[PDB]
Structure formats: structure tokens, C-alpha cells
Scaffold this active site. Structure first.
Site, PDB file in Angstrom:
ATOM      1  N   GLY A  65      32.469 -30.744 -19.119  1.00  0.00           N
ATOM      2  CA  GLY A  65      33.292 -31.798 -19.681  1.00  0.00           C
ATOM      3  C   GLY A  65      32.906 -33.156 -19.125  1.00  0.00           C
ATOM      4  N   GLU A  93      15.730 -34.849 -20.213  1.00  0.00           N
ATOM      5  CA  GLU A  93      17.155 -34.448 -20.487  1.00  0.00           C
ATOM      6  C   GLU A  93      17.999 -35.570 -21.078  1.00  0.00           C
ATOM      7  OE1 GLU A  93      17.736 -31.344 -20.784  1.00  0.00           O
ATOM      8  OE2 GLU A  93      19.893 -31.530 -21.152  1.00  0.00           O
ATOM      9  N   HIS A 129      20.900 -31.714 -23.991  1.00  0.00           N
ATOM     10  CA  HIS A 129      21.618 -30.487 -24.307  1.00  0.00           C
ATOM     11  C   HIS A 129      22.826 -30.591 -25.215  1.00  0.00           C
ATOM     12  CE1 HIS A 129      23.655 -31.469 -20.375  1.00  0.00           C
ATOM     13  NE2 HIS A 129      24.712 -31.162 -21.110  1.00  0.00           N
TER      14      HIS A 129
HETATM   15  C1  LIG Z   1      27.958 -30.872 -19.139  1.00  0.00           C
HETATM   16  C2  LIG Z   1      28.511 -30.214 -20.427  1.00  0.00           C
HETATM   17  C3  LIG Z   1      29.851 -30.780 -20.960  1.00  0.00           C
HETATM   18  O1  LIG Z   1      30.250 -31.999 -20.974  1.00  0.00           O
HETATM   19  O2  LIG Z   1      30.743 -29.792 -21.571  1.00  0.00           O
HETATM   20  C4  LIG Z   1      31.073 -29.916 -22.979  1.00  0.00           C
HETATM   21  C5  LIG Z   1      32.533 -29.591 -23.234  1.00  0.00           C
HETATM   22  C6  LIG Z   1      27.588 -29.882 -17.986  1.00  0.00           C
HETATM   23  C7  LIG Z   1      27.994 -30.382 -16.570  1.00  0.00           C
HETATM   24  C8  LIG Z   1      27.547 -29.386 -15.484  1.00  0.00           C
HETATM   25  C9  LIG Z   1      28.204 -28.003 -15.609  1.00  0.00           C
HETATM   26  C10 LIG Z   1      28.518 -27.515 -14.191  1.00  0.00           C
HETATM   27  N1  LIG Z   1      28.318 -28.748 -13.437  1.00  0.00           N
HETATM   28  C11 LIG Z   1      27.999 -29.770 -14.109  1.00  0.00           C
HETATM   29  O3  LIG Z   1      28.030 -30.926 -13.742  1.00  0.00           O
HETATM   30  N2  LIG Z   1      26.114 -29.645 -17.955  1.00  0.00           N
HETATM   31  C12 LIG Z   1      25.601 -28.394 -18.149  1.00  0.00           C
HETATM   32  O4  LIG Z   1      26.334 -27.437 -18.362  1.00  0.00           O
HETATM   33  C13 LIG Z   1      24.100 -28.142 -18.142  1.00  0.00           C
HETATM   34  C14 LIG Z   1      23.756 -27.647 -19.548  1.00  0.00           C
HETATM   35  C15 LIG Z   1      22.275 -27.533 -19.852  1.00  0.00           C
HETATM   36  C16 LIG Z   1      21.326 -28.419 -19.315  1.00  0.00           C
HETATM   37  C17 LIG Z   1      19.971 -28.291 -19.632  1.00  0.00           C
HETATM   38  C18 LIG Z   1      19.564 -27.267 -20.489  1.00  0.00           C
HETATM   39  C19 LIG Z   1      20.502 -26.387 -21.040  1.00  0.00           C
HETATM   40  C20 LIG Z   1      21.856 -26.519 -20.724  1.00  0.00           C
HETATM   41  N3  LIG Z   1      23.684 -27.027 -17.289  1.00  0.00           N
HETATM   42  C21 LIG Z   1      23.764 -27.002 -15.946  1.00  0.00           C
HETATM   43  O5  LIG Z   1      24.222 -27.931 -15.281  1.00  0.00           O
HETATM   44  C22 LIG Z   1      23.265 -25.731 -15.268  1.00  0.00           C
HETATM   45  N4  LIG Z   1      23.025 -25.852 -13.814  1.00  0.00           N
HETATM   46  C23 LIG Z   1      21.802 -25.747 -13.235  1.00  0.00           C
HETATM   47  O6  LIG Z   1      20.798 -25.532 -13.908  1.00  0.00           O
HETATM   48  O7  LIG Z   1      21.636 -25.859 -11.767  1.00  0.00           O
HETATM   49  C24 LIG Z   1      20.398 -26.161 -11.082  1.00  0.00           C
HETATM   50  C25 LIG Z   1      19.949 -25.141 -10.021  1.00  0.00           C
HETATM   51  C26 LIG Z   1      18.663 -25.110  -9.392  1.00  0.00           C
HETATM   52  C27 LIG Z   1      17.514 -25.901  -9.519  1.00  0.00           C
HETATM   53  C28 LIG Z   1      16.377 -25.608  -8.749  1.00  0.00           C
HETATM   54  C29 LIG Z   1      16.382 -24.527  -7.858  1.00  0.00           C
HETATM   55  C30 LIG Z   1      17.525 -23.727  -7.724  1.00  0.00           C
HETATM   56  C31 LIG Z   1      18.647 -24.042  -8.502  1.00  0.00           C
HETATM   57  C32 LIG Z   1      19.864 -23.406  -8.545  1.00  0.00           C
HETATM   58  C33 LIG Z   1      20.276 -22.287  -7.809  1.00  0.00           C
HETATM   59  C34 LIG Z   1      21.578 -21.814  -8.017  1.00  0.00           C
HETATM   60  C35 LIG Z   1      22.428 -22.452  -8.936  1.00  0.00           C
HETATM   61  C36 LIG Z   1      21.993 -23.571  -9.666  1.00  0.00           C
HETATM   62  C37 LIG Z   1      20.691 -24.053  -9.464  1.00  0.00           C
HETATM   63  C38 LIG Z   1      24.301 -24.604 -15.528  1.00  0.00           C
HETATM   64  C39 LIG Z   1      23.891 -23.681 -16.695  1.00  0.00           C
HETATM   65  O8  LIG Z   1      24.835 -23.934 -14.333  1.00  0.00           O
HETATM   66  C40 LIG Z   1      24.307 -22.819 -13.540  1.00  0.00           C
HETATM   67  C41 LIG Z   1      24.600 -23.214 -12.082  1.00  0.00           C
HETATM   68  C42 LIG Z   1      25.063 -21.530 -13.904  1.00  0.00           C
HETATM   69  C43 LIG Z   1      22.810 -22.499 -13.655  1.00  0.00           C
END
Ligand SMILES: *[C@@H](CC(=O)OCC)[C@H](C[C@@H]1CCNC1=O)NC(=O)[C@H](Cc1ccccc1)NC(=O)[C@@H](NC(=O)OCC1c2ccccc2-c2ccccc21)[C@@H](C)OC(C)(C)C
Ligand SMILES: *[C@@H](CC(=O)OCC)[C@H](C[C@@H]1CCNC1=O)NC(=O)[C@H](Cc1ccccc1)NC(=O)[C@@H](NC(=O)OCC1c2ccccc2-c2ccccc21)[C@@H](C)OC(C)(C)C
Lengths: 181, 181
Positions: free
Chosen positions: B146, B72, B41
Site C-alpha cells: 500500500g 523499476e 510493478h
Molecule cells: C508496494 C505495492 C503496493 O502499494 O500495494 C498495492 C495495494 C510494495 C511495497 C513492499 C511490500 C513489502 N514491503 C514493501 O515496502 N512493493 C512490492 O510488493 C514489491 C512488488 C514487486 C516488485 C518488483 C517485481 C515484482 C513485484 N515486492 C517486494 O517488495 C518484494 N521484496 C523483495 O524482493 O525483497 C528483497 C530481498 C533481497 C534482495 C537481495 C538479497 C536477498 C533478499 C531478500 C531476502 C529475504 C527477503 C527479501 C529479500 C516482496 C515480493 O517481498 C518478499 C520479501 C516476500 C520477497
């Protein structure tokens, strides 16, 4: 530095907490009995948030030296039943300089984070946020907001509490044995 | 955990960097020769910022498994003269589970910070940001933005790279030996 991390992790687990005052969020280190320490600038009131709990402050002392010079530490007596593990044995009688220290933070902004800050030098006097301040320990690390109350340690030593920074260096107030009787 | 911190600190010092892409700021781990890894990403372009320097990307591979399922991870070949210290010996052939791991971050938001994340479990499949994703390692820590590209280690092991989180758990993509030939 392995032993320095190992000591630090165990110390934060047993004696640290996250505290909110009106003046921000800080790491707080409990020292013995119901006595803990914050940077003076946290300005704890009659009540603080301690790991989300409203806790009563029975006594608070802003430390100054024999001339009345600021030391940037406030000792606080907590109204709670649990006592802290007595860590006065890990406090030096005078300012410690080390070649490798770890600064340990425990806040919302930095939960359970450990930073190897390198050499700690007895910095001495510092005009900190405009206040003459003594017994500062300095390390060359870009410390930031959210890291105050940060605990500065090396193997089997608690050196001080992080209280400020200039964007390039950080500063801890030395945590000396005699402050705690 | 002392040895785990000690290994981690030395690994970040020798093989890590801070990278900016159009998609944010990440920790980047160099693996061998001119090959490094980022979370997919981060979407590195023809050019990235590597410790403030514009660096050319000669080759980039978004990793998928034999079914085409997302892993990923993006491997990138850097146009620079220095080679990385070969750390393929520290990569497992399959997903590693440990009782105590350290996650190491090196960004503007978190410069040289180390977090003891506790137990790492082979999580398996995860719907990550809506994309089916395999070979996830999970740890119970409140990881935040971050921290992506965060390097997950234990003593003498590089386990994976942090790629996401749900506010309560964090997830690393396993960094397997066969990805690097
Ligand atoms: C790293 C980015 C960074 O260094 O910033 C640059 C300045 C960042 C770290 C994570 C953010 C929050 N916590 C972290 O550790 N990574 C991401 O943001 C990452 C980006 C991304 C990845 C892959 C494709 C596109 C973008 N995104 C996420 O971590 C993502 N979380 C997520 O998908 O959670 C999984 C969940 C899941 C799986 C299966 C069944 C049910 C669920 C579920 C239910 C409810 C909540 C989460 C999940 C982001 C987008 O966060 C949310 C939680 C809003 C989806
Ligand atoms: C901790 C607060 C926290 O946890 O946030 C709650 C959410 C915070 C950490 C430091 C901020 C930036 N770096 C840090 O590590 N501590 C402070 O903000 C602290 C507050 C304060 C202390 C004492 C009285 C009142 C408030 N303030 C500072 O750290 C202060 N910096 C400072 O005074 O720098 C010393 C400088 C100095 C001394 C002697 C000669 C010349 C100079 C000089 C020249 C140029 C720059 C700095 C200094 C704050 C207010 O920062 C600036 C740099 C703007 C003054």
C-alpha cells in the site's frame, strides 16, 4: 506546518509508545512522572503490552466531567522505573482550536506516521459509539481503526488524543492541563 | 526536519494522485506536462483509475539502464488536459543520499501520510522480487504493501519513488533528471 511536524516528531520520539490491550492496539502518550493517557475504550487492565513488554498498571482513572459526562480518556499510572519527560507545559487549560494540526500515530498498522489534518474546531458534544461525550475536537480527515491514541499537535501545543471517527471526520478528546493536577 | 515535511506536503498537494491498476493501489507523482511515474510493478494498462477516474494512458515506458537492467520505474503519459507543475528542477542528476528524508504516501490505505524514514543511502544493486535492480536508495523503515509509489523527499529534493521492502528496510528507485529528457 514545518514547525508543527518538527515538534510532533520530537514529542512522539520522547513521550510516545505503542500499547496493546484486550481491546486493540493504540498509540500511548506519557505525560509526566509515570502517568500516561489512552482512549477510555482501550480499557487497560491490570497489565498492558507497552512496546511488547508486559507492564503493570498501578492506577487508572476514566475521566468524566462535573456532571459525570464521558470525556473518553483514561489516565494510567505505570509500574516502571523510567519517568516520562514532563509535557504538562504543552497542554492547554481549555480546548484549543488551530488552523493546521498534525496527528501523529505509532502502531503496527501505522508506525511513525504523521498526518496534516487541517483545521481543528471545538466540536463540543458528540454521541460517540452511543455515549454522550464532551470536549471533542474535530478535524476533517478520514481517520480509521488503528489510529486511536493518535496525538493531535500544533507547534508547541499538545491538543488531544484521537478517540473516534465517523468515516469522514476524526475526533480527539482535549487533553487539558488540570487533568494532571 | 520541519522544512522537509513542509516541502513534502506542498509537493503531494500539487503533484500527487492515487492510482489503481489491476496490480493494486499506488501513490502517483506527476513530473511535468502529462508525464507521471509509477513503480514498474504497477503495470499500468491502456487505462488506469486516477483519483477514481478512468484516465487514458497514451504512452508508457518501463525504464532500464544501458545494459537493460531493471530500474523499476514506469513513466506514463496521461490523456488529460491539465498539465502537472514541472518539478524536474527538484530531481537530481545522480542518486542522492541524505541524513533525514520524508516518505509521503497518498492511498486509501494511507491517505496523506508522511513518514520520517531517517538516513537514505545509495544501496545500489538489489535483487527485488527476483529481478536484478539498480539505483536503489535504502532507508531503515518497516515499509508495507500500500506504500508503493510513495514519494521520498528532503528539503527541496525529490529523491525517488518507493518500490519495495523486505519487512525491515524500504527501497526507492532514484528519480533522475535525465529520465524526463
Ligand atoms: C508496494 C505495492 C503496493 O502499494 O500495494 C498495492 C495495494 C510494495 C511495497 C513492499 C511490500 C513489502 N514491503 C514493501 O515496502 N512493493 C512490492 O510488493 C514489491 C512488488 C514487486 C516488485 C518488483 C517485481 C515484482 C513485484 N515486492 C517486494 O517488495 C518484494 N521484496 C523483495 O524482493 O525483497 C528483497 C530481498 C533481497 C534482495 C537481495 C538479497 C536477498 C533478499 C531478500 C531476502 C529475504 C527477503 C527479501 C529479500 C516482496 C515480493 O517481498 C518478499 C520479501 C516476500 C520477497
Ligand atoms: C480507534 C481504535 C483503534 O486504534 O483500533 C485498535 C486496533 C478507533 C478510531 C475510529 C474508528 C473509525 N474511525 C475512527 O477514527 N475508535 C473507535 O473505534 C471508537 C471506539 C469506541 C469509542 C467509544 C465507546 C466505545 C467504542 N468508535 C467510534 O469511533 C465509533 N464512531 C462513532 O460513534 O461516530 C459518531 C456518530 C454520531 C454522533 C452524533 C450524531 C450522529 C452520529 C453518527 C451518525 C452516523 C455515523 C456515526 C455517527 C464507531 C463504533 O463507528 C460507527 C460509525 C460505526 C458508529
Amino acid at each position: 506546518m514545518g514547525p508543527a511536524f518538527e515538534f510532533a516528531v520530537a514529542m512522539m520520539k520522547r513521550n510516545s509508545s505503542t500499547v496493546k490491550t484486550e481491546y486493540g492496539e493504540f498509540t500511548m502518550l506519557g505525560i509526566y512522572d509515570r502517568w500516561a493517557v489512552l482512549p477510555r475504550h482501550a480499557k487497560p487492565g491490570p497489565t498492558i503490552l507497552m512496546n511488547d513488554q508486559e507492564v503493570g498498571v498501578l492506577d487508572a482513572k476514566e475521566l468524566v466531567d462535573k456532571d459525570g459526562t464521558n470525556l473518553e480518556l483514561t489516565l494510567l499510572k505505570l509500574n516502571r522505573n523510567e519517568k516520562f519527560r514532563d509535557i504538562r507545559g504543552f497542554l492547554a487549560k481549555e480546548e484549543v482550536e488551530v488552523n493546521e494540526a498534525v496527528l501523529a500515530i505509532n502502531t503496527s498498522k501505522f508506525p511513525n506516521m504523521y498526518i496534516p489534518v487541517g483545521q481543528v474546531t471545538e466540536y463540543g458534544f458528540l454521541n460517540l459509539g452511543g455515549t454522550p461525550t464532551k470536549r471533542m475536537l474535530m478535524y476533517n480527515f478520514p481517520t480509521r481503526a488503528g489510529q486511536c491514541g493518535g496525538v493531535l499537535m500544533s507547534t508547541g501545543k499538545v491538543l488531544g488524543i484521537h478517540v473516534g471517527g465517523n468515516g469522514h471526520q476524526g475526533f480527539s478528546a482535549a487533553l487539558l492541563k488540570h487533568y494532571f493536577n
